[PDB]
Design a protein around this ligand. Structure first.
Ligand SMILES: [Cl-]
Ligand SMILES: [Cl-]
Length: 272
């Protein structure tokens, strides 16, 4: 990861608190002198060596990916204190919270664009050999232009959130890119539901058993039939029958091609 000079970093405001310390926003002056807005995470004073290792370790994973749909790592500060992780600024925050403020306020085509971005980032992540294992709307960040990018590599592994996890990964810990596709189906439900919680407050034992029995989340209100079927396809019990991320991107691109296909609508509790 690129070591940044702290003289090029200015902290504007403290957005909130993270696991290892403060989450801030600010500006980064690039070597060319151009200035960009950035997110800045600071490791808390008095950190343990393991905290430093886990903090920077997650930046190291994020830094493997250069893609428009994956949060960009501008760099780290390890040679002065506080230790810092600097990433691209995403004005509208986490996708689930952003959509909850907006219920029913976006067009279907806007929502599909958000979903296409997420799928494109996952296509690259899975091309690179990584299984995210955490894919959820809370782990997607959304910028001022509504571009959605994958974040939160804490659980990412080179080749547990029950509500987002495929039946086989719950059962035996079988985590593949196809279990990420399952999670993507959950994200698709979250987006089309404007940030409703998957399976609401159901007991986790009942989430596990209901899905195993063949029950699935019901179609969000006014959900296009193409998009609900895509959820069900991501939710296939047999992981080999789920679409690949490249196929998901293709499916969403064609829906964007003609918006008229989105006008066909599907016609709470889980459906068998
Ligand atoms: Cl620098
Ligand atoms: Cl959960």
């Amino acid at each position: 990861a690129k070591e940044l000079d702290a003289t090029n970093i200015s902290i504007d405001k403290v957005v909130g608190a993270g696991e290892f310390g403060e989450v801030c926003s600010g500006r980064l002056k690039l070597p060319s002198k151009k200035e960009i807005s950035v997110a800045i995470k600071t490791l808390k004073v008095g950190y343990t060596e393991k905290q430093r290792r886990d903090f920077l370790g997650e930046a190291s994973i994020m830094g493997q990916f250069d893609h428009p749909n994956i949060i960009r790592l501008e760099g780290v500060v390890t040679k002065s204190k506080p230790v810092m992780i600097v990433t691209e600024y995403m004005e509208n925050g986490s996708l689930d919270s952003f959509l909850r403020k907006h219920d029913a306020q976006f067009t279907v085509i806007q929502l599909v664009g958000m979903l296409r971005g997420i799928a494109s980032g996952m296509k690259y992540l899975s091309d690179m050999g990584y299984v995210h294992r955490d894919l959820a709307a809370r782990n997607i960040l959304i910028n001022s232009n509504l571009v959605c990018k994958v974040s939160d590599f804490g659980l990412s592994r080179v080749l547990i959130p029950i509500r987002w996890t495929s039946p086989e990964a719950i059962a035996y810990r079988k985590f593949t890119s196809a279990s990420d596709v399952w999670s993507y189906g959950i994200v698709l439900w979250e987006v089309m539901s404007y940030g409703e919680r998957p399976y609401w407050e159901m007991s986790n034992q009942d989430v596990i058993k209901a899905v195993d029995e063949g029950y699935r989340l019901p179609p969000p209100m006014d959900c296009p039939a193409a998009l609900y079927q895509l959820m069900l396809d991501c939710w296939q019990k047999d992981r080999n029958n789920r679409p690949k991320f490249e196929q998901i991107v293709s499916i969403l691109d064609k829906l964007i091609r003609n918006p008229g296909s989105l006008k066909i609508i599907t016609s709470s509790n889980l459906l068998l």
